[PDB]
Amino acid sequence: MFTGSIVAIVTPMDEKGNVCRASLKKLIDYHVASGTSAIVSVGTTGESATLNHDEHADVVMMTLDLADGRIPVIAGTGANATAEAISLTQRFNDSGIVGCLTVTPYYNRPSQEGLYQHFKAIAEHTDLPQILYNVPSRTGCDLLPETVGRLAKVKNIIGIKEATGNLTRVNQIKELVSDDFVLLSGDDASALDFMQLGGHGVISVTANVAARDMAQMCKLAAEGHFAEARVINQRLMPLHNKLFVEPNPIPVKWACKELGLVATDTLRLPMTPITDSGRETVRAALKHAGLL
Amino acid sequence: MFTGSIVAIVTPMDEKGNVCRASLKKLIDYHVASGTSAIVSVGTTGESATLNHDEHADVVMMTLDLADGRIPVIAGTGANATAEAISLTQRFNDSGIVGCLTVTPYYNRPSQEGLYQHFKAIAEHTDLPQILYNVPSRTGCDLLPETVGRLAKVKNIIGIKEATGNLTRVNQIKELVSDDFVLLSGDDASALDFMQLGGHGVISVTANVAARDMAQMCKLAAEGHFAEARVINQRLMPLHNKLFVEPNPIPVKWACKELGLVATDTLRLPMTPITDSGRETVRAALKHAGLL
Ligand SMILES: NCCCC[C@H](N)C(=O)O
Ligand SMILES: NCCCC[C@H](N)C(=O)O
Ligand SMILES: NCCCC[C@H](N)C(=O)O
Ligand SMILES: [Cl-]
Ligand SMILES: [Cl-]
Ligand SMILES: [K+]
Ligand SMILES: [K+]
């Protein structure tokens, strides 16, 4: 649903740069097999920026079809224009999607008031649960805990993906929102720490290629078995880091291909192919995790 | 024209958020009469993010039509997807614009090699001059001088809007490009310093409301009369700063309204109306500049 290991799934593409169904089907089966709790479709790692609105909707609907009720699917619906965010969201109303992941507007650097009005308006145009998403390093914008508190009062604003890697945010937000508001890490390297502080899970890039370990680690964390969970975290830490050796999702797409999970590691410009050095780095990280 | 005071023009809107032709005409006539070198149409200050592709093109074409040959128009054509950038550019080929201002992809954080391939691909499918645009605070991405140097070898890549406010970039870039390559400030508050170091002009937010003073300041700077330019700059400095007291273009649209240059200060979400405290700040800066 909205806890545990949630995969920020890649959009696998053929050499032409269009979604590859066979690869998408292989990935989804793998997540179902591995115990992944849910899939985020066409979020950041799914190359949301470079899919047009129709292409974006198609990938989400295809993911939902292929999941075939076996695993929940959350749609990426973020946009930096409120009217676009509303349109994208309306696309998935009454679709089978369990919720939306919606990022703070990027580039235009809205005020906290603007963030409030943006997300409130979006929530008002849907019955679907909304997970806010803060990632200042990508957006130029930082959704502060006070504003998260203000927004958590909206009935269908139910959680946040917190990707700052600033762990003080966990308890700053938790103090301002109801006990059923969900706190999800958006930073693999700090996600276990985030859970140890009271977070409920992670929207993970690492989970694309270590789905079983990620699921197990989040289960252990949820049970309060943090020392056990850390053994797994330490095995995965090189992946947590080196999957960003080059811009995400360049490394994780290559890793998927290397593991036979997808047919090609093709991306859309301005993402470009992994370097030879990046290949060796990511391979060593996979070896360390015992995946290769 | 790619030197001197270039205005990063507002997209004046009515109360419903639709482009106001009468207000835009007034602004263009003001810039013609006040000595502005050129108009950037639908750039960052023009709310590029919240205009759809069709609306974007409409504003550029309206701006050309109204300019009626009296002032050069540069079109904002930036996108975080290389396909979108190319498509936008194709709409404006043979339109009458003199060039394009194209920002580094935002949100997806491409590598330097990605930036290279993005801008090379855009430049390839047009004869129009391209001005690169670097603004890490908005994009999450920093186009480094090394890569600017590489790109400058492409025939129609002819300049950069450098909005870091990091003044070391001026001569780091200058050393790597030909004498013909234009270096334009994208930070009003450091723009005169930027020109004193070798820069050729400024793509200015302040120029929306202080067009004549900006024009004179930049001419004095081009002539090496830095102490003289600095007197003007010091009267404008409150505005250079306070036009960002709330997210651009909120303050500057309000200021335009206050001077009678536009009918309404309306924006599109996620921009929201100026606060009262913001009104007071901006008003005081306008008075300091001798404009009210
Ligand atoms: N995936 C939907 C369309 C994205 C449009 C644009 N590239 C943006 O990032 O906002
Ligand atoms: N102005 C063209 C359409 C823009 C699409 C999207 N809002 C972006 O900022 O990239
Ligand atoms: N108008 C579309 C142009 C094609 C660009 C596309 N991004 C590519 O990789 O080829
Ligand atoms: Cl995501
Ligand atoms: Cl601009
Ligand atoms: K709520
Ligand atoms: K050139």
Any idea what the Cα angle at residue B145 is, between residues B140 and B147, rounded to 5°? Answer: 80
Classify burial at A70, counting beta carbons within 10 Å of its beta carbon; exposed 0-12, middle 13-18, buried 19 or more.
exposed
Q: Given the structure tokens 């050729």, which residue do they identify?
A: B200
Q: What is the dihedral of CA B233, B140, B103, B214, to 10 degrees?
A: -10
Q: Is B225 helix (H, G, I), strand (E, B) or coil?
A: coil
- Tell me which of B252, B268, B269, B274 to substitute to probe the interface with A (most A C-beta atoms closer than 10 Å): B269
At B170, the amino acid letter reads V
Helix, strand, coil share (%) of chain A residues, nearest 5: 45, 15, 40
Question: Among this protein's residues, is A161 annotated catalytic?
Answer: yes
Q: Given the structure tokens 């999450």, which residue do they identify?
A: B140
- Residues B29, B192 contacting (CB under 8 angstroms): no
- Residues A130, A119 contacting (CB under 8 angstroms): yes
Shortest CA gap A20–chain B (Å):
19
Any idea what the Cα angle at residue B28 is, between residues B86 and B132, rounded to 5°? Answer: 30
- Residues A183, A160 contacting (CB under 8 angstroms): yes
Q: How many CA atoms lie within 13 A of B216 on its CB side?
A: 13
Rounded Cα distance between A149 and A181, Å, is 10
Among B45, B58, B84, B138, which residue has the most ligand 2 atoms within 8 Å of its CB, making it the best to mutate?
Answer: B84
Residue A97 marked as a ligand binder: no
Q: Are A247 and B108 inside 8 Å of each other by CB?
A: yes
Q: What radius of gyration, in Å, describes the C-alpha atoms of chain A?
A: 18
- Residues A40, A203 contacting (CB under 8 angstroms): yes
Helices B82-92 and B112-124 meet at what angle, rounded to 10?
30
Helix, strand, coil share (%) of chain B residues, nearest 5: 45, 15, 40
Rounded Cα distance between A98 and A130, Å, is 10
Any idea what the Cα angle at residue A215 is, between residues A49 and A64, rounded to 5°? Answer: 45
At A165, the amino acid letter reads G
Classify burial at A58, counting beta carbons within 10 Å of its beta carbon; exposed 0-12, middle 13-18, buried 19 or more.
middle
Per-residue HEC secondary structure of B202-237 comes to: EEECHHHCCHHHHHHHHHHHHCCCHHHHHHHHHHHH
At B285, the amino acid letter reads A
Rounded Cα distance between A130 and A148, Å, is 12
Among B44, B48, B108, which residue has the most ligand 2 atoms within 8 Å of its CB, making it the best to mutate?
Answer: B48
Shortest CA gap A33–chain B (Å):
30
What region, left, alpha or beta, does residue B120 occupy, with left being phi > 0 and alpha being psi -120 to 50 degrees? alpha
Q: Which two tokens stand for residue A16?
A: 């032409």
Chain A to chain B, count of Cβ pairs less than 8 Å apart?
Answer: 121
Residue B59 CB neighbour total at 10 angstroms: 24
Q: Given the structure tokens 């999941």, which residue do they identify?
A: A67
| Residue-wise DSSP of A35-47 | T--EEEESSTTTT
Residue A148 CB neighbour total at 10 angstroms: 27
Residue B230 CB neighbour total at 10 angstroms: 17
Q: Among A30, A133, A242, A253, which one carries the catalytic annotation?
A: A133
Q: Which two tokens stand for residue B145?
A: 């001088």
Rounded Cα distance between B176 and A60, Å, is 45
Peptide bond into A270 cis (omega under 30): yes
Contacts A268 to B, Cβ<8 Å: 81-83
Q: Which two tokens stand for residue A273?
A: 């192919």
Q: Are A50 and B81 inside 8 Å of each other by CB?
A: yes
Using alpha carbons, select from B90, B95, B99, B100 the residue that is nearest to residue B48: B100
Contacts A114 to B, Cβ<8 Å: 247, 269-272
Q: Is B15 helix (H, G, I), strand (E, B) or coil?
A: coil
- Residues B50, B253 contacting (CB under 8 angstroms): no
Rounded Cα distance between B73 and B228, Å, is 29
Per-residue HEC secondary structure of B84-99 comes to: HHHHHHHHHCCCCCCE
Helices B21-34 and B211-222 meet at what angle, rounded to 10?
40
- Tell me which of A106, A143, A250, A274 to substitute to probe the interface with B (most B C-beta atoms closer than 10 Å): A106
CA distances from A275 to A22, A281, B196 (A): 26, 10, 40
Q: Which two tokens stand for residue A163?
A: 């990707």
Long-range contact pairs involving B11-17 (C-beta distance under 8 Å, separation at least 24): B11/B42, B11/B46, B11/B47, B11/B51, B11/B59, B12/B253, B12/B256, B12/B262, B12/B263, B12/B264, B13/B264, B13/B266, B13/B267, B13/B268, B14/B263, B14/B264, B14/B266, B15/B264, B15/B266, B16/B266, B17/B266, B17/B267, B17/B268
φ and ψ at residue B114, rounded to 5 degrees: -60, -45
Classify burial at B259, counting beta carbons within 10 Å of its beta carbon; exposed 0-12, middle 13-18, buried 19 or more.
middle
A141 Cα distance to chain centroid: 18
If you measure CA to CA, which chain A residue comes closest to B104?
A: A270
Using alpha carbons, select from B147, B156, B122, B159 the residue that is nearest to residue B40: B159
Q: Is B184 helix (H, G, I), strand (E, B) or coil?
A: strand
Classify burial at B81, counting beta carbons within 10 Å of its beta carbon; exposed 0-12, middle 13-18, buried 19 or more.
buried
Q: Are B117 and A81 inside 8 Å of each other by CB?
A: no
Using alpha carbons, select from A185, A180, A158 the residue that is nearest to residue A170: A185
Q: Given the structure tokens 């263009």, which residue do they identify?
A: B28
Q: Which two tokens stand for residue B259?
A: 């001077």
CA distances from B91 to B97, B103, B156, B160 (A): 11, 17, 17, 22
Rounded Cα distance between B136 and B44, Å, is 13
| CA A87 to centroid of ligand 1, rounded, Å | 12
Q: Is A166 helix (H, G, I), strand (E, B) or coil?
A: coil
- Tell me which of A205, A271, A274 to substitute to probe the interface with B (most B C-beta atoms closer than 10 Å): A271
Contacts A121 to B, Cβ<8 Å: 269
Q: Where are the beta strands (DSSP E) in A232-283?
A: none
Residue numbers of A between 118 and 177 with CB closer than 8 Å to B: 118, 121, 137-140
Q: Is B8 helix (H, G, I), strand (E, B) or coil?
A: strand
Residue A112 at interface with chain B, using a CB cutoff of 8 Å: no
Residue A34 CB neighbour total at 10 angstroms: 18
Q: Are A138 and B80 inside 8 Å of each other by CB?
A: no
Q: Are A110 and B82 inside 8 Å of each other by CB?
A: no
Rounded Cα distance between A62 and A64, Å, is 5
Domains in chain B, CATH or no CATH each: 1-292 (3.20.20.70)
Q: Which two tokens stand for residue A252?
A: 């994780």
Q: Which two tokens stand for residue B261?
A: 């240059």
Method: X-ray
Q: What radius of gyration, in Å, describes the C-alpha atoms of chain B?
A: 18
Using alpha carbons, select from A105, A98, A67, A69 the residue that is nearest to residue A84: A105
